[PDB]
Amino acid sequence: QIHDITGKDCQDIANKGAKQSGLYFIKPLKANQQFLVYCEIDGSGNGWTVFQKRLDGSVDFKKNWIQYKEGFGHLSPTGTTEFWLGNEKIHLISTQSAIPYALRVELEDWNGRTSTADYAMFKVGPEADKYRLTYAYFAGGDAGDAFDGFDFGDDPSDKFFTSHNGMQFSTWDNDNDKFEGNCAEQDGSGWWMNKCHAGHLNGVYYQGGTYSKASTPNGYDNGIIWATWKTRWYSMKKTTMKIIPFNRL
Numbered sequence: 487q488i489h490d491i492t493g494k495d496c497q498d499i500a501n502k503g504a505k506q507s508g509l510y511f512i513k514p515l516k517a518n519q520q521f522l523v524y525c526e527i528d529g530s531g532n533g534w535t536v537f538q539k540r541l542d543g544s545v546d547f548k549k550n551w552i553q554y555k556e557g558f559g560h561l562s563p564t565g566t567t568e569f570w571l572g573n574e575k576i577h578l579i580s581t582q583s584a585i586p587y588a589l590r591v592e593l594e595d596w597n598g599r600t601s602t603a604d605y606a607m608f609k610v611g612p613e614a615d616k617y618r619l620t621y622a623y624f625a626g627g628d629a630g631d632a633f634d635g636f637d638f639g640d641d642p643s644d645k646f647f648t649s650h651n652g653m654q655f656s657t658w659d660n661d662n663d664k665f666e667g668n669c670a671e672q673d674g675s676g677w678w679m680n681k682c683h684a685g686h687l688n689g690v691y692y693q694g695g696t697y698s699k700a701s702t703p704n705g706y707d708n709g710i711i712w713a714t715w716k717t718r719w720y721s722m723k724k725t726t727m728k729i730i731p732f733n734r735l
């Protein structure tokens with residue numbers, strides 16, 4: 487169920503001998519109390535700390551500010567459950583000791599194809615700054631750089647409106663986006679919204695992937711999307727968001 491070795495993150499845990507993916511206790515520099523996390527440990531001693539997982543539509547991602555801050559969903563020793571670790575925990579891990587962390591977004595198709603997109607020097611700010619997302623540069627990956635924004639063709643400033651670097655976090659009850667309306671409320675989720683999005687992994691789980699403007703009454707593109715890999719009308723089968731110290735790349 488839960489393993490004995492502990493550390494500051496899953497890489498530290500892997501550096502101490504553990505070789506099995508599963509549940510572990512970690513305690514980041516500023517964390518006053520230890521908490522449970524799911525570590526993904528591969529054959530090369532890489533230990534990834536997973537903070538978000540989607541795979542079957544068992545959890546509703548339309549949660550409020552406090553829920554996204556504290557975390558929701560279920561942690562499993564088998565890694566077959568959906569959850570959001572919690573913004574406060576993501577903040578404590580990503581900013582401890584100025585250690586440079588890399589974020590890996592892993593996506594899976596309804597056709598079996600998996601893709602990734604890596605971001606160097608990933609960080610999540612404190613609550614005072616509404617858990618802002620910042621990264622140095624896109625490090626590569628076949629899923630493409632959706633965080634850089636995308637020109638959908640709706641408005642000439644589309645790219646400026648869809649980038650995510652520097653965006654604060656938003657939930658329906660705590661709007662901090664760059665939109666006149668409420669992106670989080672219209673979509674029904676919690677995310678780093680701009681004048682909405684180009685990459686949005688906390689959207690509605692549409693079975694089969696393909697959906698349309700007709701699926702929803704207002705026709706919102708509120709699925710689990712990553713514009714640089716698939717159309718805004720295609721919802722992902724599985725997603726994984728995980729972090730590891732930059733030097734492990």
Ligand SMILES: [Ca+2]
Nearest residue numbers: 661665666667
């Ligand atoms: Ca707004």
